[PDB]
Amino acid sequence: DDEVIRKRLDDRRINLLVKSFIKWCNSGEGYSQYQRMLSTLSQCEFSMGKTLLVYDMNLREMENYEKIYKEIECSIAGAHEKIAEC
Amino acid sequence: KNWEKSGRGESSTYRDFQQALYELSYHVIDISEFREDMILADVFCILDIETNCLEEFTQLVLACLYLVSQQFNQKSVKIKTKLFYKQQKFNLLREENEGYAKLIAELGQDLTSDLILENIKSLIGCFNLDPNRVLDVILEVFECRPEHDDFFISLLESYMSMCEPQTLCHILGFKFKFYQETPSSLYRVAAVLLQFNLIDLDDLYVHLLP
Amino acid sequence: LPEARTRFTKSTRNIKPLLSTFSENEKKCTLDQAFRGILEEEIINNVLAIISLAIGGVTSTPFVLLGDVLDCLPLDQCDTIFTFVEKNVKNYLLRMCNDLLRRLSKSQNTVFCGRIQLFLARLFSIPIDYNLYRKFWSLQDYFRNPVQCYEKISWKTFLKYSEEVLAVFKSYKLDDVYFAKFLTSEKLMDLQLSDSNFRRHILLQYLILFQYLKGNYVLTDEQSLWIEDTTKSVYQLLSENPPDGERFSKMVEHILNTEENWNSWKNE
């Protein structure tokens, strides 16, 4: 129960979009349904692009964290120098 | 025997073949044996086919049971509302032990309001102190130290610059409603705030008992 | 009808031009789609705030736009856009702020965390006794978790370390660039002893802990008498503080008195 609820994790939005598409298709006014399907597919394309952008942002954040770790190593070296100064 | 031959016969081409097998199984409307004869991709395709068929009766329910080999709604709503967007302010006093301890130890030091403002912002950020409780503790320290008045008045003016003006009114109303069901210090604080025009008379007057 | 989508993409590329070319909800939906698309174009290739302001002045969408942008823009334009939203003054705002709080490290973004929370509020060699260090910071761990003061060995070790540490406190008798969190300095170990504010931190934590404990979940009568006696000794120690010891003690007394009122959970 709780495990599946947690694994559900957005995902609900894409699932609802796919479900609405399947429902409209099973129902298939037809031009309006095709246009709604096109709207849903464009929304899904925007969601895929957003996921790709989020992955790129995570990669850039990892790179920045590596740079900050190098900076913290330099700060520890400066702390040893300040220990000599102390 | 055509079904057995089709099953024995059959990543673009592989995905196409898997989708074709799923479509054939959907058009079937015993297949479990052939499914187990050959994977995790097969299990995922079976789950997708079951979801689509549920989207697209008794026969379908029986097929799902064979292939298997209300309060939940509110529970999921609570789980998502807690995980995704929780207030998580550590309001009262004792949740953030280090936080309020260091806050009061910073307010009670020997006696520059900008430095204390930045220190309080840093403490809020590090220990997740609720802003309203911070303002309450500040007002109380202002009560117990009635010598340094203008300093805390500039601090209260700068702090309320970054908050809603009606927070002070409601907080004073709470601190007065507590004693309803009232020392001189409480009245002194409200009088000082009213004099320097920090809060209007209407809200405080409404909060009073008589 | 997709001709209307093309017309919207055209007339959207200052504000009065699109305001006039717009002269029904499906059209608004296609326009929001075009807004998202051009925002994606901008972020791939600031002006995003300009477009969000244009849409807001046209008026929904802008909250979704800010959410997507803050999910995309990692650090700096994220700060600029957050300041912009601060200047702008529903649940989407809460989602954005929570995602930001979950992304920040609280290591060098502390002031930014404070700003986010304030906005959320505006919404609604040398001989070292390593064993003494162990005792002190295990006491600190007890401070971190109050529920640990209910078992037998836990409460016993807490009492032992507390008695030893307070005995050292009383026997010290001092009689005399910002650190937000505690600094566990195994080589210094001593400059925190000389600071009276450090002792104030420790004793105020003690007082809040005892106040919560007095407010399962039951105690022994001997333990409660121990709590009262230690409260008295803590007040004695706070009085020993050279700068207005008794004034500070009375201030903390008023604080912890108001604490009882705050414990009434004024949800109404």
Add this chain to the structure above:
Amino acid sequence: SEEAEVDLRDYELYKYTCQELQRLMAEIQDLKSRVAIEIEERRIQSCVHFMTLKKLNRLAHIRLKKGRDQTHEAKQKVDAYHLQLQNLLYEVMHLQKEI
């Protein structure tokens, strides 16, 4: 789990996504321009496209979750290193203040 990292490492996935979206657009244009056998074939291909889209969305969401988790772990490591460096700097500052 290595299969997910391999598929994420090696834009081609987004191109195949957009190509299947073009396929689905061609099929819905065929249905809008349009026999029961062709309608059933077409519907089967549309359902296959929908299933492929669902699987791709699930894979992308899982990859995003894993990436965010790794980033959070790196952030915690950097914060620990920064706290150690801050303790060192506090020690140096207090030693300069006492001396």
